[PDB]
């Protein structure tokens, strides 16, 4: 979380290096302890026929959330992807954080960021629901419409182009907000009953289930590394079904 051994971070958008730092903010002084992703994954790059994809991974847990995970990206020199995951351990019942950023040359093209439900009713808790709701309606004028695996992400998702610096900073600050939010809710969650952490365990199982389904992010690491390894990526490392 301190990305400052990050060999990505220097050539990153602006907009994804903020991002970041707000995210590593927001965790540095958690209890931490590390998880480890599968090979103990950190660093690693790949190329087939076309550009490389690089990555690095930093993952951490606490004892509300099971994993949480920061993901940055490269696709040859001007493909940047900033992707983050607070997957909640079901016991506490929060929701999940999610953010995607992807950028290139041209700009930030698409920004997401959410608190996703993992209810049976699809509705976050009625703390998240008041907090989100005080922040007020943020306006963008590029707004993008989720595809239909996206149904899993709340009323609050957002999913935009940022259309000039004060969109890109805004939205920043949303992120921000919702990982105070979060982290607020997360020290006054109480473990759940059996029947609870179930319901929960099995929102979770489907947010993965769905978030698998994004053809532009299997699209990309096909592209660099093959069908079997992008397969064993995405299932294992990004979006991990529990069980
Ligand atoms: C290896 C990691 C990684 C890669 C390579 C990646 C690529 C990536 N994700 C994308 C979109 C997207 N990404 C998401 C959302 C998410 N994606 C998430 O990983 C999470 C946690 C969310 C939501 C919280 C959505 C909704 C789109 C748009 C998909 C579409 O347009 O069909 C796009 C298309 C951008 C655009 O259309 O402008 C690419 C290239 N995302 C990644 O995370
Ligand atoms: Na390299």
Redesign the pocket.
Same mark, same amino acid.
């Given at each position: 979380l301190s990305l400052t051994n990050s060999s990505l971070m220097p050539t990153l958008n602006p907009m994804i290096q903020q991002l970041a730092l707000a995210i590593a903010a927001s965790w540095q002084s958690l209890p931490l302890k590390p998880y480890q992703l599968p090979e103990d994954l950190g660093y690693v790059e790949g190329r087939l026929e076309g550009e490389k =994809?690089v !990555?690095e991974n930093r993952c951490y847990q606490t004892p509300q959330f099971r994993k949480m995970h920061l993901?940055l990206?490269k696709?040859g020199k001007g #493909?940047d !992807? =900033?992707?983050? %995951?607070m997957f909640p351990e079901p016991l506490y019942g929060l929701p999940l954080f999610?953010?995607?950023i %992807?950028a290139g040359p041209g700009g930030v093209? +698409?920004a !997401? +960021?959410?608190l996703?439900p993992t209810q049976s009713d699809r509705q976050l808790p009625a703390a998240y629901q008041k907090s989100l709701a005080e922040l007020g309606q943020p306006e963008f004028e590029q707004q993008?419409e =989720?595809?239909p695996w996206?149904e899993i992400?709340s009323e609050y998702?957002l999913?935009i182009?940022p259309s000039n610096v004060t969109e890109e900073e805004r939205f920043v600050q949303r992120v921000v907000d919702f990982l105070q939010i979060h982290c607020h809710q997360s020290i006054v969650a109480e473990p759940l009953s059996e029947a609870q952490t179930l319901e929960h365990r099995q929102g979770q199982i489907h947010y993965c289930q769905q978030?698998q389904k994004?053809?532009?992010?299997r699209? %990309? =690491?096909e592209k660099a590394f093959g069908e079997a390894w992008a397969e064993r990526?995405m299932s294992q490392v #990004?979006?991990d079904v529990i069980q």
């Open positions: =994809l !990555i993901e990206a696709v #493909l !992807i =900033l992707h983050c %995951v999610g953010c995607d %992807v093209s +698409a !997401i +960021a959410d996703s993008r =989720l595809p996206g992400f998702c999913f182009r978030q994004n053809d532009k992010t699209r %990309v =690491l990526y #990004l979006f």
